[PDB]
Enzyme design. Structure first.
Site, PDB file in Angstrom:
ATOM      1  CG  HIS A 163      -0.552   0.273   2.443  1.00  0.00           C
ATOM      2  ND1 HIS A 163      -0.092   1.264   2.882  1.00  0.00           N
ATOM      3  CD2 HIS A 163      -0.640  -0.664   3.544  1.00  0.00           C
ATOM      4  CE1 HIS A 163       0.111   1.250   4.311  1.00  0.00           C
ATOM      5  NE2 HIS A 163      -0.096  -0.138   4.773  1.00  0.00           N
ATOM      6  N   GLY A 181       2.530   6.002  10.257  1.00  0.00           N
ATOM      7  CA  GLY A 181       3.866   5.954  10.225  1.00  0.00           C
ATOM      8  C   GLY A 181       4.333   4.731  10.626  1.00  0.00           C
ATOM      9  CB  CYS A 236       2.489   1.190   7.533  1.00  0.00           C
ATOM     10  SG  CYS A 236       1.004   1.469   8.194  1.00  0.00           S
TER      11      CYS A 236
END
Ligand SMILES: COC(=O)NC[C@@]1(C(=O)Nc2cncc3ccccc23)CCOc2ccc(Cl)cc21
Ligand SMILES: [Cl-]
Lengths: 298, 302
Positions: free
Chosen positions: A41, A136, A138
Site C-alpha cells: 500500500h 507511520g 506501517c
C-alpha cells in the site's frame, strides 16, 4: 525471581530498518541482503496496475543518512520487494516464518525507518495483535530469535476500528480475514489462549505464587466444556504435551492446573493477584516461560 | 491506538555487553570507549559477601586476574579502579560500537529499559520503574549481575542502572553507573529488606490521561478535589503523596484532554473507593503505575 513481559533483544532487527517513500506516503521497510520488503500500500485498489505505472526512481529508500538506489521491484501477495544495488552488511542470519494464533513475538515499532520501541505481543486467536501503533508505523516487523537466527513473522499493515492491528507474514499473506484496503473491516470475537494462561500459572508457581492451587484434577473434556463457556480456546492433547516439562518441574499435572483454572474462571481471584496481575495473562507461551525461568541468551 | 509497556530498542546497549570473570565469579560488564564497568562484588568469593573489604580484596588483584570477553574475543585489561560500588577495568581496545551516551542518576517513579544478560550475552529486554522504596521489580536470575537499565533520547543512551542484587522478597537492588546504590542498600549479604512499597501516584494519573486520549472516559466524575484532600485519601491506599511538581508535570496532558489535574485526582479517589467493577482501563484490571507523564506523551504523540 521476577516475571516480566520480555521482548527479544532488537539489535539484529534495528540494523535492517529503512525508510520507504513513494509519492506522499512514507513507511518502514526491512532491508535484508539486496531487497527491501515493505507493505504494497506504499504505492497507493488494483495494485498490479498502480505498480505498473511506477519506475525504480519513484521509490526513495533511506538507510540512516544514506539513499539506497532501487534497481528493481516486484510484488509478492501484499508485500512489495524493492531490489536495491547494495546488500545490507548488517544482514543477520534469518528465516521468514508464518506463526499460528497463540504464538508470541517481539515488535520493533518504527517511524521514518527509525526504531522507537520494542514490545512483546501475541497473535490473537482472531488473528489481530493488540499492538501500540501510530500513523507511520506501517512496515514495522514482528520477530523471534532462536540462537543467532532471526525469524521474521509479521509486518504491520493497518489498524482496525477497535484499535487492534492487522498485518501479514513476510511473504505478504495476511493473518486473518483482512485485506489492505480502506473498507468496512472488523476483528472477529476474540478468545483467551488457554495453553498460555496455563503456562503463566506454572510461571507463577515457580515464582512462589501458589494460593490458587487446589487438590482437584479434571478431564480434558470436562475442562473444555467449562473453557468454551468462558470464551477460552479449546485445550488439545498437544497443549497438554507441550506443558509436560513445566508440569514435571512444579509437580502439578496439567489437568491438576486446569482444575485451578476452572475454579478461577467460576469464582474469580477474590481480591488476590497472580504475578502482580488481577486478570489471567495469556501472552506468554510455555516456551516463553521456560526461556525466562532459565535465562536463555542470544 | 493501543497502549503497551514499551521498552527502548536495545541494539545500542547490546553492542556494549561483555563477560567479566574474576576467579570463580562470572558476571556482565558494560564496555564503553576503553573502560568496562561492572559490579565490584565480582572480586568476592564464598566467605566474602557478609563483610567484604573491597579495598583489601582489590589491592591483592592484578590486571591479568580479570578475564574480559567481548563475543569470542578476549580484551586485555591494562588498569583497574573502584568508584563507589562499581569496578572500572581499563582495556586496551576502545569499543567501536560505543554509542553516544551519558550516565544519569534517576529518581523513584522514573522508568527505564533493562537488557537482561547472562555471560555477556543479552537474553531479553523489558520496561520497568524505580519504585518509591528504591527497588525494581525486575526479572533476574543468578548471573544477571551487571545487566543495565537505560533510556534513549533521540540517539543518546542514558545509562541509569546496573544490577547488583536480589533482596529476599524477590525484588532487585542496584546502583547508578557511578556505583552509588539506589536506596539504603549495600553490596553485602547482610540481612537487608526493601521498605514498604507504595504506588507512584503521578504515574497512575499519567496512565489515566493515556486512557482518555485513547477514548476511555468511564472512570471520570463531576467532582474536583484540593491537593491536600487527595493526599489524605491517597495515603490510606499506600499511594505516594502528589506534590505541586507532579501537578505541574501533568499540565500538558491536562491541556490536551481538557481534564484539570485535580479533576483527574477526584476520579482516581473514586477508583480507589469503588474498584473497577468488572471493567478494565487500557486492558488492565489494576491501576498501572509504571508509565511516566513523559512516557505517555511519547507513546501517544511521538
Ligand atoms: C560474589 O557474590 C555474588 O555474586 N553475589 C550475588 C548475590 C545476588 O543477589 N545475586 C542475584 C542477583 N539478581 C538476581 C538473583 C536471583 C537469584 C539468585 C541470585 C541473584 C548473591 C546473594 O547475595 C548477594 C548479596 C549482595 C550482593 Cl550485592 C549480591 C548478592
Ligand atoms: Cl529522574
Amino acid at each position: 525471581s521476577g516475571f516480566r513481559k520480555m521482548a527479544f533483544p532488537s539489535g539484529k532487527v534495528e540494523g535492517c530498518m529503512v525508510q520507504v517513500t513513494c509519492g506522499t506516503t512514507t513507511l518502514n521497510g526491512l532491508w535484508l541482503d539486496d531487497v527491501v520488503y515493505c507493505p504494497r500500500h506504499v504505492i497507493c485498489p488494483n495494485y498490479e496496475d498502480l505498480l505498473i505505472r511506477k519506475s525504480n526512481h519513484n521509490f526513495l529508500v533511506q538507510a540512516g543518512n544514506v539513499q539506497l538506489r532501487v534497481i528493481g521491484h516486484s510484488m509478492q501477495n501484499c508485500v512489495l520487494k524493492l531490489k536495491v544495488d547494495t546488500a545490507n552488511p548488517k544482514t543477520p542470519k534469518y528465516k521468514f516464518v508464518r506463526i499460528q494464533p497463540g504464538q508470541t513475538f517481539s515488535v520493533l515499532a518504527c517511524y521514518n525507518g527509525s526504531p522507537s520501541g520494542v514490545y512483546q505481543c501475541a497473535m490473537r486467536p482472531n488473528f489481530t495483535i493488540k499492538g501500540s501503533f501510530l500513523n507511520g508505523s506501517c512496515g514495522s516487523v514482528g520477530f523471534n530469535i532462536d540462537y543467532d537466527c532471526v525469524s521474521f513473522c509479521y509486518m504491520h499493515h493497518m489498524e482496525l476500528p477497535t484499535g487492534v492491528h492487522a498485518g501479514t507474514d513476510l511473504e505478504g499473506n495476511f493473518y486473518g480475514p483482512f485485506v489492505d484496503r480502506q473498507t468496512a473491516q472488523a476483528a472477529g470475537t476474540d478468545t483467551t489462549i488457554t495453553v498460555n494462561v496455563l503456562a503463566w500459572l506454572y510461571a507463577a508457581v515457580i515464582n512462589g505464587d501458589r494460593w490458587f492451587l487446589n487438590r482437584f484434577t479434571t478431564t480434558l473434556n470436562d475442562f473444555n466444556l467449562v473453557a468454551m463457556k468462558y470464551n477460552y480456546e479449546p485445550l488439545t492433547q498437544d497443549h497438554v504435551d507441550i506443558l509436560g516439562p513445566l508440569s514435571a518441574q512444579t509437580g502439578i499435572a496439567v489437568l491438576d492446573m486446569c482444575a485451578s483454572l476452572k475454579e478461577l474462571l467460576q469464582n474469580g481471584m477474590n481480591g488476590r493477584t497472580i504475578l502482580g496481575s488481577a486478570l489471567l495473562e495469556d501472552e506468554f507461551t510455555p516456551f516463553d516461560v521456560v526461556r525466562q525461568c532459565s535465562g536463555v541468551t542470544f
